[PDB]
Design a protein around this ligand. Sequence first.
Ligand SMILES: *OP(=O)(O)OP(=O)(O)OC[C@H]1O[C@@H](N2CN(C)c3c2[nH]c(N(C)C)nc3=O)[C@H](O)[C@@H]1O
Lengths: 129, 48, 279, 126, 48
Amino acid sequence: GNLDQAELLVTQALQKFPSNALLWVEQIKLFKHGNKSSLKKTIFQDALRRTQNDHRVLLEIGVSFYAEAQYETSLKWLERALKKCYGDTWVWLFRTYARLGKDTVDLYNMFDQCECTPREILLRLMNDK
Amino acid sequence: FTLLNRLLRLIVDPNIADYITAKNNVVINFKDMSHVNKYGLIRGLKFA
Amino acid sequence: QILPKIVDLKRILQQQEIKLLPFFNEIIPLIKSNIKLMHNFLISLYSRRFPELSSLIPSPLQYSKVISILENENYSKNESDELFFHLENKAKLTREQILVLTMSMKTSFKNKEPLDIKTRTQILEANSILENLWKLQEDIGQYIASKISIIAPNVCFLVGPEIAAQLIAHAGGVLEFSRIPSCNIASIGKNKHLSHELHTLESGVRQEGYLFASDMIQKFPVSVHKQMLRMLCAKVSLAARVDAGQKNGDRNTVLAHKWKAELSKKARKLSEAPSISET
Amino acid sequence: MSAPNPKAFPLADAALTQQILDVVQQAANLRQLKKGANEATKTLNRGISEFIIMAADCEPIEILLHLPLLCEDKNVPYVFVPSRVALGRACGVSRPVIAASITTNDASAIKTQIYAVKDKIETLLI
Amino acid sequence: NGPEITPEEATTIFSVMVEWLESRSFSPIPFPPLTYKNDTKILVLALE
RNA sequence: AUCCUUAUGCACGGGAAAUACGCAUAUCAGUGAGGAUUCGUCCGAGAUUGUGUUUUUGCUGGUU
Ligand SMILES: *OP(=O)(O)OP(=O)(O)OC[C@H]1O[C@@H](N2CN(C)c3c2[nH]c(N(C)C)nc3=O)[C@H](O)[C@@H]1O
């Protein structure tokens, strides 16, 4: 608790490094209930410019949407994170189509090409929501 | 226009239709006078 | 849980009808976040039914209401002008907003199937939640509108208390509003922006907010509007920054007097126009 | 001078002002600087700032006094310099300027002047 | 006085086009793609 | 001592433009000029007003 201080710990830590990839993920996770809605767009640009590229930034920005809403808007991001691929992304993907429909089996082969309980877990993670 | 946008959507992809509807607003000057064109079609534009 | 928590807060405010306002600050971000959920949750339900309505009707309250009206069985017999009348009367719309609905009604959605019972329930439950939230938000502003002389003596002096109350209810506090940089203010009370909006004013004001409706703007000829938002929007933020600074026990106006004097005198000069030239 | 504004704090001396205003201008020419209040207030919200400089004799002073309370939450140093007219020049502007925020680029050429001056400024905040 | 087309009037109009195009089986015109065959031929025509 | 960066000054050499360049006992202007927006926000310094010259400014050379 006191995520309020986590605002500053990110800041101090991010002043020092900053290009680090992880640190921006927690700067992002913040805006979820960080409730500062204005600057979120500008900060996703910086996170995506500062580290550029990456995965976890793209994945976390994606999830910030899926968490909220707009299951269609979070698709672009998660799909955009794959083209740079690694198991963290696929979970959110199947979740999205669940809130969407009918695409599930065909996407499945891709999974095997990126590889065993990975088939068995996917269901484990599909039961989360 | 509010009809025109719809009809062009029917026959075209919105991104263009929106442009066509927008291009006809403008602000028309003749020497000292000036009025926005809300209602009619301006026939001086190429796609008219 | 909503109805339980909602009923008391309206009465908790009505029972009082200072300490609350700091709680008020916390609340304003919270209500808004939830509404953008429920609104975006209702869209999830009509993606199948009527995909274009998301665009054409932007705000949740007018979207949630049209959800119902359109969903209602009684109107659906067909060749009912009741629909039109209803929209106009019930979920406030202007002629322009209906024309789009009518035609968009033809291309996209299917009336062959009327949405299922489960989903109907969800909508009803979602609509009720939305209404509860919206009422709460509306109530908050009035209470704010009552305290304006107390919390923001300068801002009411320029803009007028009807509006100041609307502004401060957006960031949810004087502090928050003082943080806002002046370019972003003028766009607060803007309904939204869609492609077929079909707008270019004579003014040349691309963004029309709550401030745009104020006194210090529309008391002047139409040519000087785009110059007077900007000139006023800055002095609002200067006023709002002073209000946060000001001690709660004593609030003194005086800053406003300069900032009106300048503004009225400055607006005159823009209008005045050139002195005539020797040939 | 005139009575230096009691709310002005930390107030840089003569020797620090020369060292600060010189950094300002040195950043202006690399366009790492941002001038004015709102431009500076924008910076902090984003999180790119290094330190804020303000005018002490800004008339009335209450219009910038919000910056200090914002800076303390983002952990960003700040100081007042004794005139606005001088700060106007350093930013490359004809006309008076009451606040300015140097920004971050960690590939920058001047990086080592900045850490120098923040080190000096944070001392003043006791 | 607002737009003179009246909502009830509009449906009658817009409905006719909708049936015609569908009757005629009309694919809508796409947006001009970045890679498009005729971009050259259609610039030269247009500029000349 | 070498080397490197930015600003300013004089300068060889190479280009582009003059519908362009200025001037004012004159109005405002980061205490926000003037714009952009995917509507969430984003850039941040000149805009008015009167005026001077603008198919040309100075300077040489040929041929009649
Ligand atoms: O060029 P000259 O020998 O005339 O320099 P000066 O005689 O003016 O005298 C003292 C200065 O010499 C410079 N030097 C000289 N050397 C060899 C040297 C210098 N500086 C450094 N550093 C400071 C890194 N390293 C050296 O090896 C200095 O400027 C002295 O002030």
